[PDB]
Each structure stands twice: as C-alpha cells, then as structure tokens.
Amino acid sequence: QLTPRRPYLLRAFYEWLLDNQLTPHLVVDVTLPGVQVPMEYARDGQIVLNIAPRAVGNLELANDEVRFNARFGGIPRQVSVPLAAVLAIYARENGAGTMFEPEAAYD
C-alpha cells in the first residue's frame, strides 16, 4: 500500500557517504530485468558501480531508477538500474554503508 523506502535510504546513505568524504559504490544484481549496465564488469550475477560525483555524470537517484552515464572501456555508456535491482551501497575505502532489506513493492 505504502511506497517502498529504498530510494530514500539510498539517497541518505549516498549523501552520508559523500559527507564522510567516501567513495560510494552501488551494488547491483544484474540478474533482474530492466538493468542496463556494462555487463563486462558483472561477476557472479552482480556488479559494483562507482557512483561518486567525480566518476559519473548526470546522476539521478530517483525512486524508480538510478540513472547516469559514464565511459567504460572508452565507450560512452548510459546506465539504468531499477531500484528493485539495488542490493546495497558501500564506501570503497572503509566499507561503511548498508544492504537494503527486501520490500513488497519489489516482488
């Protein structure tokens, strides 16, 4: 009945990480549908994308999707990750962050 909270938590942890001068990495499960990522880096069914302001462009941490574009292997790429497919957000350095609990809306 109520919307999922995952995108809001993702935004808060993202900011939190940035304020602690950390490099946020999004952990995505590329097995799910709608996931548009550079599969060449996916391994064991999941991919870890650096989403720091520096490393990416046009970042939109929306409720429906996490979108952005960046160059991989020298090729411009447009990335789209349904929130359903967002596993966790960790800092590359320390590891601080969180794994998102499953939610009814993402079934």
Add this chain to the structure above:
Amino acid sequence: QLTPRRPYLLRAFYEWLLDNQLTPHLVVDVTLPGVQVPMEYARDGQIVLNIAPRAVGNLELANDEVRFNARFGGIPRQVSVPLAAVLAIYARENGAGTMFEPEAAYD
C-alpha cells in the same frame, strides 16, 4: 570513526512519510542535555512532536539538531532538539516509521 547517520535517516523517513501523504511525528527524549521543548506535554521522559509542514515552521532537520518554530498553548515557542535526543519518527495514521539505532557519536 565516521559521523552519525541518524540525521540523514531522519531526513529520508521524513521525506518518505510526506510522499505517502502521512503525518510525521518525532519521539524525543526530554531527558538529554540541550533539549528545548514545551515540557508541559512531555510524558514520562518523552515528548511526541508533530513535525508535519503545516503544524510547524522553519523546520530544519540539520545534522546537529532539529529546529523549528510552533505555538504551544497560544504562545509562540522555539523548539530545539539535539539529534542525540531523537528516538524515532513515525506516521501518526499507521505507525509507519523507525526507531533510530544508538550511535557512537551520541554517547
């Protein structure tokens, strides 16, 4: 280690609740140092403060403290609650929300 995330979590749930058209209330510990709330309404050490945009003014959910203006008992009052004293946030209509985990920075 790192700074506390409660402020960011507080902001996210606050956003999440309003987006679901719910009424967010704070649950404050009036026992801690620096808490500035209209004590007349505190009950057994805690005060439930409605923080919806209407029932409040100049709401500031900063990292250090929650500040806002409101009138309690016909008299205009300034509320100020150090993040350390915020126990939980929740929707008055369905109890949706969360109680914050204790964090190091607040000992």
